[PDB]
Paper text:
Here, we characterize an upstream component of parasite GPI anchor biosynthesis, the putative phosphomannomutase (PMM) (EC 5.4.2.8), HAD5 (PF3D7_1017400). PMMs are responsible for the conversion of mannose 6-phosphate (M6P) to mannose 1-phosphate (M1P), the precursor to GDP-mannose. HAD5 and other PMMs are part of the haloacid dehalogenase (HAD) superfamily of proteins (Interpro: IPR023214), a ubiquitous family of enzymes that primarily conduct phosphatase and phosphotransferase reactions. By regulating the expression of HAD5 in transgenic parasites with a TetR-DOZI-inducible knockdown system, we demonstrated that HAD5 is required for malaria parasite egress and erythrocyte reinvasion, and we assessed the role of HAD5 in GPI anchor synthesis by autoradiography of radiolabeled glucosamine and thin layer chromatography.
To uncover the structural basis for HAD5-specific inhibition, we solved the X-ray crystal structure of HAD5 to 3.5 Å resolution. Like other known PMMs and members of the HAD superfamily, HAD5 comprises two domains with an overall fold similar to that of HsPMM1. There were no large structural differences in the overall three-dimensional folds of the human and parasite enzymes. Although many active site features between the Plasmodium and human enzymes are conserved, an active site loop contains significant sequence variations. This loop in HAD5 contains Met173, Gln176, and Ile179, whereas the corresponding residues in PMM1 are Arg183, Met186, and Phe189. To develop a model for how compound D9 may interact with HAD5, we computationally docked the ligand into the active site of the HAD5 X-ray crystal structure. The resulting position of D9 in the HAD5 active site is similar to the crystallographically determined binding mode of mannose-1-phosphate in the X-ray structure of human PMM1 (76). The docking solution orients the hydroxyaminomethyl group of compound D9 in proximity to the sidechains of residues in the variable active site loop. Furthermore, comparison of D9 to similar but less potent compounds used for HAD5 inhibitor screening, D7 and D11, indicates that the hydroxyaminomethyl group is a key determinant of HAD5 inhibition compared to the human PMM. Finally, the crystal structure of HAD5 is likely to be valuable to ongoing efforts to develop more potent and specific HAD5 inhibitors as antimalarials.
Author numbering: 9 to 246
Amino acid sequence: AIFLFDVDGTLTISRKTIEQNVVDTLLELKSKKGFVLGIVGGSDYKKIREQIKYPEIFDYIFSENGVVAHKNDEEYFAESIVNFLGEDRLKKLINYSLKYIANLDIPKKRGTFIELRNGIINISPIGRNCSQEERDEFFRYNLKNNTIEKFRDNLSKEFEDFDLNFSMGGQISIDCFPKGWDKTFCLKHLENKFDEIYFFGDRTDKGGNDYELFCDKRVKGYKVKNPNDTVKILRENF
Ligand SMILES: [Mg+2]
């Protein structure tokens, strides 16, 4: 049996490192007669390893929603979005996005409008690099005019043919990933004779990242509030 965890918000306070109260609890699990630990999070592995200090507690580490798997701190294997779309359809979605981001009248435009990660293509009309304030400042401009929801409605319809999903990302970006690459993807790597897999996430409701995993019959899911509540949900049942 393996245990599965969301990184940001479930094992650590989001964007910061891991408190020692929690890691002491995981050590007891892999020290309880028959348990292995694995994690799945949207972030690239460098951020994840930074967040958890020790990748060695974890037999299997799945980053970018399981489209990237790691083991004993070696990469092993992981695919890319370009291998899915192909160089042609990509230079179609790309230059439609910039041509739209271009002619869009918003007050502040910056840079890194299209970030290519392994799993997703992050599209953002203001731009990825902007002082944390400009991030929040555009978030409220979004509440007034719903600028970003209008963006997805174009891509979601124009590229309905691409088998593509465009879900609203953070405050300033729309994540663009292939259909069925939510978080249930990491199930593909776990036919390793593992009888029961338990999962722990944050936003396990529809319109959330780890929602599609919970109701995937394959595994029992638990909804936790915060990391201190998580440690409670572990100690209580295990
Ligand atoms: Mg989370």
